[PDB]
Design a protein around this ligand. Structure first.
Ligand SMILES: COc1cc2c3c(ccc2cc1OS(N)(=O)=O)[C@@H]1CC[C@H](OS(N)(=O)=O)[C@@]1(C)C=C3
Ligand SMILES: [Zn+2]
Length: 257
């Protein structure tokens, strides 16, 4: 089964998922001098005041917080998007050292981690249908740098002991994802893919320019999770990021100058 190890990592994924070598794979390096400012792009509209978090889960490749997506409660609109996209989950990618961990890079700069807020287009009725469409998902990507602590992340950090190994989950209610956003919503956007199998080419990526800062003690606790299930040889969950893929026929747009 796929993973991030030497014998099952990203360089192997194309054997089971041949779309790994496709034309709109993610992540990419964002070349800030080649991205084009597009005045047609609109501000993002993030409406998370009514979000209902449900559960937090170690899925063996990351940890994720899931939300109730049965109604328009936490939605993303505007920017490059047509229509309304509902928040389903968020999860992170991070490194073994502070100089790596993000999936997207900016002028080849890697950040310590990257937060993905995954949303699906309500036109398609359920997330399984949306993954089959070129405009089915919108993922908001936020970089993490190491510095001052982020108070709104601490509730996540404190529960990670209870989901240390693959398949563990816990109730995780009343978590407000607004505490994870930077002050600015300036963004880059391009058409891309999921960065894990099945690598489907269904994602409008919206990558925020401004990182959030987290403390070294906060990111340390990510690195103590396990890829393995309980009672198996311990392997720390680190470096669960896919390296940058070829941009090919694509243009990255910026909402700012
Ligand atoms: C990082 O992993 C991501 C996985 C995503 C998935 C899905 C949607 C978004 C995902 C986003 C993921 O994050 S990431 N790194 O590209 O932003 C699936 C849609 C239907 C599918 O279910 S099925 N029956 O094929 O087992 C889902 C729920 C499975 C994975
Ligand atoms: Zn992700």
């Amino acid at each position: 089964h796929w993973g991030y190890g030497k014998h099952n990592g990203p360089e192997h994924w194309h054997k089971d998922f041949p779309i790994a070598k496709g034309e709109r794979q993610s992540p990419v390096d964002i070349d800030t001098h080649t991205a084009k400012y597009d005045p047609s792009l609109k501000p993002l509209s993030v409406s998370y005041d009514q979000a209902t978090s449900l559960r937090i889960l170690n899925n063996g490749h990351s940890f994720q917080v899931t939300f109730d997506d049965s109604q328009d409660k936490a939605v993303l609109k505007g920017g490059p998007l047509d229509g309304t996209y509902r928040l389903l989950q968020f999860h992170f990618h991070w490194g073994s050292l502070d100089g790596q961990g993000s999936e997207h890079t900016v002028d080849k700069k890697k950040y310590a981690a990257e937060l993905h807020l995954v949303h699906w287009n309500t036109k398609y009725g359920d997330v399984g249908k949306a993954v089959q469409q070129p405009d089915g998902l919108a993922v908001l990507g936020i970089f993490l740098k190491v510095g001052s602590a982020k108070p709104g992340l601490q509730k996540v950090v404190d529960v990670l002991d209870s989901i240390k190994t693959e398949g563990k989950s816990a109730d995780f209610t009343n978590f407000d994802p607004r505490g994870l956003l930077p002050e600015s919503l300036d963004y880059w956007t391009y058409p891309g893919s999921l960065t894990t199998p099945p690598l489907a080419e269904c994602v409008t990526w919206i990558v925020l320019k401004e990182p959030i800062s987290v403390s070294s003690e906060q990111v340390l606790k990510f690195r103590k999770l396990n890829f393995n299930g309980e009672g198996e040889p311990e392997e720390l969950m680190v470096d669960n990021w896919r390296p940058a893929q070829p941009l090919k026929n694509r243009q990255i747009k910026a909402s700012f100058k």
